[PDB]
Design a protein around this nucleic acid. Structure first.
Lengths: 102, 121, 124, 122
RNA sequence: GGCGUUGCCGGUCGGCAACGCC
RNA sequence: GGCGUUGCCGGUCGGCAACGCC
RNA sequence: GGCGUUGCCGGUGGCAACGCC
């Protein structure tokens, strides 16, 4: 039950997920290990599906050249707040590196 | 036909990013700039293929968005009201009312009383 | 008590004359001259009697001249209307730690009067 | 206004009273009060004439009270022998830039006398 | 995080920053 | 490197450090 | 006026809630 609600909370929120405090490790780590969630930073986690088409959006954007944080925010319709961590997470996992999709 | 097939994936991603607040027919007509029942030749083709799903006359939901909405609705259930469901997805009657009518028609959720119940099929 | 004790009175006075509007506290003075409280307390009281220092509060003594000058600055600031602690501080280029004790002292000798959170100069 | 000019004179004085032993230069005062040399020069002379300020050199004027106190500090410092410029700077807690002009001024009105690289209060 | 000391700020019993310690 | 402005230092016409320019 | 919390913004401070003083 608590694992289903945790999942929905992130799924419903999508590209603008709640922070650890807002939702407030035992459970989250489990979902991460189950492919349900993925850690972007110490702050908040993202639903993998949400992270999925969110990545698909970034990819379809960099098609027409580089792109800064501002541009990223527009396509995802989020805010520099949530878009900056996400984009940094992508530089990490090597999805990108303005920015370019490598 | 490059400037033709690129309009199909173009619309798909449009409904893809819109998720639970899908753009209406009338609305998408101007966003891409295309005739009335002419956009139909695009929407319906994607419809038959299954990429888009028609909930009502006004708008369609991308294949996935429906799946996920159905997942959140599956969690929400014993019984639930339209308000509880609207909060479950954090949406408005504008879209939720139509989606629930759809889910009734496809026998996903049945209206047992003034509330619906996700039929465990 | 000889003549080197007399130089001590001079070096003490100068400590206050130089420090001016940010006078050293009893503790700092004791430390600077390496004095026992009892010695310092009597030296200060002597300087007060001789009209060299004026006691603002148990912590701070002010050189009489420093005080007189601060009163002139405050008098001019008070010309345009009542004034708050912050303006007195800006006017003196000092800090709250040093200015509040001066203003409380001035209210006490009735040079100024605090009404609300402002003061007005009544004296000369 | 007249009372407006009167206030301006109180603010010039205050500027010198507050700054004491590190008085602002002519240039600095002009910029602060947004005055033209012509005006500042006459205002200062008024102040000197009024016994409020004392000209130390061409850049520096000192408040009369700040000068008297610096003299007192120098007197006690020289009580135990000739003193150098650096010793004067330490006793006053100032800097060479402000102290040397003061000492040259004091030699001038003969308060002190320089002999070699040291001074004595006459 | 907690405690303390100091400084500056805002009238005043707080806020900010050193530093000490747990 | 060169020139320059400023500040502190050393009696004074130089040392140190910002800063500006070349 | 001091300060703090939060949101948006511009890649790293600006505007604006709300709050304490």
């Amino acid at each position: 039950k608590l694992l289903k609600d945790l999942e929905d909370k992130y799924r419903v929120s999508r590209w603008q997920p709640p922070s650890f405090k807002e939702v407030a490790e035992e459970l989250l780590h489990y979902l991460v290990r189950e492919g349900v969630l993925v850690k972007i930073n110490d702050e908040f986690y993202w639903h993998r599906q949400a992270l999925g088409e969110a990545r698909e959006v970034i990819k379809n954007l960099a098609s027409t050249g580089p792109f800064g944080l501002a541009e990223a925010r527009d396509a995802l319709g989020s805010s520099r707040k949530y878009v900056l961590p996400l984009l940094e997470y992508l530089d990490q996992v090597k999805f990108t590196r303005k920015r370019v999709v490598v």
